[PDB]
Amino acid sequence: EVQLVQSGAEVKKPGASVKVSCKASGYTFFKYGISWVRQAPGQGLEWMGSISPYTGETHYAQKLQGRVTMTTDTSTSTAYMELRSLRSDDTAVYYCAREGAYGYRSPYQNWFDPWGQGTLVTVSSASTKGPSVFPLAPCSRSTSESTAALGCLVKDYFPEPVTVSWNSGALTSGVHTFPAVLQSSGLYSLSSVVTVPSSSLGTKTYTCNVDHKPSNTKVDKRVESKY
Amino acid sequence: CLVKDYFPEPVTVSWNSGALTSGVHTFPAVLQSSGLYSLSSVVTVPSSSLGTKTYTCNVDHKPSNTKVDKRVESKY
Amino acid sequence: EIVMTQSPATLSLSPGERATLSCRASQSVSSYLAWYQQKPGQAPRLLIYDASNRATGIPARFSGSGSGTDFTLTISSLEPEDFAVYYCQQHSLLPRTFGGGTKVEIKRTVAAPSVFIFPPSDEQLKSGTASVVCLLNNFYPREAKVQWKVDNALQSGNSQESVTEQDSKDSTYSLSSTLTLSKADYEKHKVYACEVTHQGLSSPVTKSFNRGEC
Numbered sequence: 474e475v476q477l478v479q480s481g482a483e484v485k486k487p488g489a490s491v492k493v494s495c496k497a498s499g500y501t502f503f504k505y506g507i508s509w510v511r512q513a514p515g516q517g518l519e520w521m522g523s524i525s526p527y528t529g530e531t532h533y534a535q536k537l538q539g540r541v542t543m544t545t546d547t548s549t550s551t552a553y554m555e556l557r558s559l560r561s562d563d564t565a566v567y568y569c570a571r572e573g574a575y576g577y578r579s580p581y582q583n584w585f586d587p588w589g590q591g592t593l594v595t596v597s598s599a600s601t602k603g604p605s606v607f608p609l610a611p612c613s614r615s616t617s618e619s620t621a622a623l624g625c626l627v628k629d630y631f632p633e634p635v636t637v638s639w640n641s642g643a644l645t646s647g648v649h650t651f652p653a654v655l656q657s658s659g660l661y662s663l664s665s666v667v668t669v670p671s672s673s674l675g676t677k678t679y680t681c682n683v684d685h686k687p688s689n690t691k692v693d694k695r696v697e698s699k700y
Numbered sequence: 701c702l703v704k705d706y707f708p709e710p711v712t713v714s715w716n717s718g719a720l721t722s723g724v725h726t727f728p729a730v731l732q733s734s735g736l737y738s739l740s741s742v743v744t745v746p747s748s749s750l751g752t753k754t755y756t757c758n759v760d761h762k763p764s765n766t767k768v769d770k771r772v773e774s775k776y
Numbered sequence: 777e778i779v780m781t782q783s784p785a786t787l788s789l790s791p792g793e794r795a796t797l798s799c800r801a802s803q804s805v806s807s808y809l810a811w812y813q814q815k816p817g818q819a820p821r822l823l824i825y826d827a828s829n830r831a832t833g834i835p836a837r838f839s840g841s842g843s844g845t846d847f848t849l850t851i852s853s854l855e856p857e858d859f860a861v862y863y864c865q866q867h868s869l870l871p872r873t874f875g876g877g878t879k880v881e882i883k884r885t886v887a888a889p890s891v892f893i894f895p896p897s898d899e900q901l902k903s904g905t906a907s908v909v910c911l912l913n914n915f916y917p918r919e920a921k922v923q924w925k926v927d928n929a930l931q932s933g934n935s936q937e938s939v940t941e942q943d944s945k946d947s948t949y950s951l952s953s954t955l956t957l958s959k960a961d962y963e964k965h966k967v968y969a970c971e972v973t974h975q976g977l978s979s980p981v982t983k984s985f986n987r988g989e990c
Binding site for chain 1: 777808810814818819820821822825826831832863865867868870871872873874875876877890892894895896897899900903907909911913914936937938939940943950952954989990
């Protein structure tokens with residue numbers, strides 16, 4: 474269909490650009506002006522530039538004029554957008570989409586419907602590291618409580634994400650994956666997955682299987698009581 | 701047990717009303733310079749295959765007519 | 777740079793009747809803006825393309841009005857798969873401002889967090905750090921507090937919180953403030969209490985332990 478293949482999720486420390494192939498498909502080019510829009514996670518969206526496909530009219534947005542360069546590749550209808558002197562503000566999922574060209578022969582669109590799927594770019598100076606999981610998965614008998622919960626402490630990993638499963642994904646009840654809240658310390662985001670077992674489960678160990686594939690690290694854990 | 705801060709002599713201590721006599725080593729009334737309240741202790745040596753057993757030093761200090769029974773368990 | 781102000785900041789509605797939404801413009805856009813369906817962790821999807829007219833496979837219930845300052849988005853027949861952050865966005869003025877964000881939640885009732893503080897591991901004491909994790913779990917809404925107490929000392933800044941999404945199953949939430957300390961400041965104290973104040977809680981629930989207890 475009228476589709477966009479974005480490629481690909483990539484981070485840079487403060488360095489050079491993350492020029493994204495925005496591969497168009499299904500619809501004809503040189504009639505449909507393609508934009509770019511950034512959105513930081515948990516934030517609103519920011520349109521940041523839109524070329525006309527042929528006779529490339531740049532229309533870069535405010536605060537980056539400048540740092541952005543957008544190019545066209547109408548041999549095979551991909552488009553591109555760079556950034557210059559990258560910076561920690563550029564922790565945003567970059568979406569390309571199509572305004573529609575505001576020429577004379579181009580058909581009427583205003584509404585961005587090829588939609589691109591998104592591209593993870595966080596600008597980041599951290600190094601690729603596995604998590605340092607500091608769990609507690611006790612035998613639900615801390616002091617006296619019946620449905621005593623447990624959870625691991627997925628700490629100090631980079632980049633995203635970790636993949637955590639309780640006992641190779643056996644314990645799915647009570648699973649509440651805390652998102653990657655990002656450390657201001659070393660840009661090593663923090664997550665945790667917890668479950669709520671009962672006190673009549675004390676002869677059961679629970680292994681969060683924390684598997685951080687961008688560092689190719691795999692973590693299995695358990696914690697018991699203290700006599 | 702830790703027989704602490706009594707006066708006068710003596711305390712009379714028995715494990716589980718004198719049931720546990722093995723390992724009994726009554727430490728004498730070493731006298732505090734603090735308040736002249738002498739200190740004693742009676743200990744026993746049980747084995748780890750006795751964990752489902754409470755042991756009560758029955759500390760009975762008759763010149764004050766006081767009787768003390770005790771036990772302590774683990775910490776989860 | 778026409779500011780687009782969405783009049784519902786968020787919304788919570790147990791699935792039912794008309795859940796109409798609103799966005800206002802700083803100028804007269806005059807029916808030249810669109811509605812969007814940024815689902816969580818997903819690419820946004822076009823709902824309405826020009827203030828109405830129900831873009832290209834939208835099912836049955838997503839009309840809207842406007843023309844030309846304050847625009848509406850009618851979620852008439854709620855259909856709880858549609859719980860997503862929604863967006864007005866002007867187009868016919870540059871630069872092309874988006875809206876604010878229209879996180880549509882579910883309104884079950886206000887529930888109490890099952891609060892569970894967790895000591896740092898001794899493996900973390902082998903790392904020379906300490907992070908105390910205080911749960912909140914299975915509650916509603918997100919409006920909560922965590923007041924860390926370090927031998928009853930109201931502390932913050934050493935604590936990063938973590939908000940689950942609203943569950944599809946029980947519509948709940950789960951929090952964890954993570955009181956990340958040094959090992960040295962950890963060794964200075966024992967009573968590590970976590971004063972949690974939530975609406976489902978009748979009291980500010982202070983979940984505590986001692987350093988070396990559990």
